[PDB]
């Protein structure tokens, strides 16, 4: 568990069908660095909020996972939840 997981879950829950569509694409739109893994868009559509929270934290790390979440969210042009999510994990 941890604040990263709690806050990512909260964020995903606060996103809508539209935002989750764009997020699920964005998560595999902005090219990821080498080391980590990419959750493909098929996977992301078959997954939901908690399924992502578990995968996106386990498949990376807590800090990197919440960082990714706020990063990709900020790439969506969403800035409110990005900054809040950042502090939700690490105020």
User: So what CATH class is 1-91?
Assistant: mainly alpha
Q: Which experimental technique did the depositors report for determining this structure?
A: NMR
| Torsion of Cα atoms, 61 then 4 then 80 then 28, to 10° | 30
- What is the DSSP code (8-state) at residue 91? -
Which residue is it, tokens 């935002």? 19
- The total number of residues shown for the chain amounts to 91
Helix locations, the chain, DSSP H: 3-14, 17-26, 41-46, 49-58, 62-75, 80-90
Residue 53 · residue 8 · CB < 8 Å = yes
- Report helix, strand or coil for 90: helix
Give the pair of three-digit tokens for residue 70: 């706020």
């Amino acid at each position: 568990m941890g604040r990263a997981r709690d806050a990512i879950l909260d964020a995903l829950e606060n996103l809508t069908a539209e935002e989750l569509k764009k997020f699920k694409l964005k998560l595999l739109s902005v090219p990821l660095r080498e080391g980590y893994g990419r959750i493909p868009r098929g996977a992301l559509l078959s997954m939901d909020a908690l399924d992502l929270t578990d995968k996106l934290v386990s498949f990376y790390l807590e800090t990197y996972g919440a960082e990714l979440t706020a990063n990709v969210l900020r790439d969506m042009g969403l800035q409110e939840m990005a900054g809040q999510l950042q502090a939700a994990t690490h105020q």
